[PDB]
Amino acid sequence: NPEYDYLFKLLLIGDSGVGKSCLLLRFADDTYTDSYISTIGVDFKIRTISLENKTVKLQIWDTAGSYYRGAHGIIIVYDVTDRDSFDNVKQWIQEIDRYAMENVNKLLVGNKCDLVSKRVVTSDEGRELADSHGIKFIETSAKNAYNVEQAFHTMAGEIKKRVQ
Ligand SMILES: Nc1nc2c(ncn2[C@@H]2O[C@H](COP(=O)(O)OP(=O)(O)O)[C@@H](O)[C@H]2O)c(=O)[nH]1
Ligand SMILES: [Mg+2]
Numbered sequence: 001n002p003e004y005d006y007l008f009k010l011l012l013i014g015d016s017g018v019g020k021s022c023l024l025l026r027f028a029d030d031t032y033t034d035s036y037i038s039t040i041g042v043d044f045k046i047r048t049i050s051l052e053n054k055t056v057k058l059q060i061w062d063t064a065g066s067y068y069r070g071a072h073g074i075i076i077v078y079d080v081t082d083r084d085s086f087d088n089v090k091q092w093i094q095e096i097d098r099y100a101m102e103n104v105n106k107l108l109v110g111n112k113c114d115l116v117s118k119r120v121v122t123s124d125e126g127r128e129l130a131d132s133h134g135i136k137f138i139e140t141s142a143k144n145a146y147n148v149e150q151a152f153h154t155m156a157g158e159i160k161k162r163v164q
């Protein structure tokens with residue numbers, strides 16, 4: 001009996017400091033530290049999930065390579081407390097659309113939503129950007145786990161719809 005029905009390669013991209021590695025560690029290991037992480041110590045993380053009746057193995061990178069790793073899905077992360085990281089999403093997307101797989105799936109993530117007093121990008125602004133690009137949007141906090149599992153499951157769900 002085969003271990004899994006599907007293998008999906010996922011890449012997290014976005015400006016330095018937005019929480020890409022923290023999002024991965026929370027999802028894959030259910031850990032979080034405020035302490036600086038230069039490297040997670042491995043090239044990628046593996047987690048297996050269930051989608052309807054299918055077992056899906058997720059192979060996830062928090063660093064670019066090929067540059068986009070032949071990813072089936074790309075999670076674009078900004079920090080809701082950092083306006084520059086949000087504006088730069090426009091550039092990340094532009095590069096994905098030109099240089100990643102032609103029909104790669106995309107998800108917009110606004111991270112650090114636990115920091116309500118430091119927020120400078122509204123949820124509505126995040127949603128507007130995602131809508132303009134025809135992609136889904138989710139706000140997360142790696143710190144308290146809010147929406148982290150949902151973000152990756154949502155990404156997997158979008159890929160599955162495309163590959164059947
Ligand atoms: N308050 C809060 N801080 C976060 C969150 N995620 C990451 N951080 C902080 O942001 C820093 C940068 O995160 P990191 O994962 O290294 O960002 P990366 O450069 O995109 O890989 C971390 O060291 C944490 O201090 C979050 O969800 N909430
Ligand atoms: Mg990192």
Ligand SMILES: [Mg+2]
Pocket residue numbers: 083084087
């Ligand atoms: Mg700027």
Ligand SMILES: [Mg+2]
Pocket residue numbers: 084
């Ligand atoms: Mg800058």
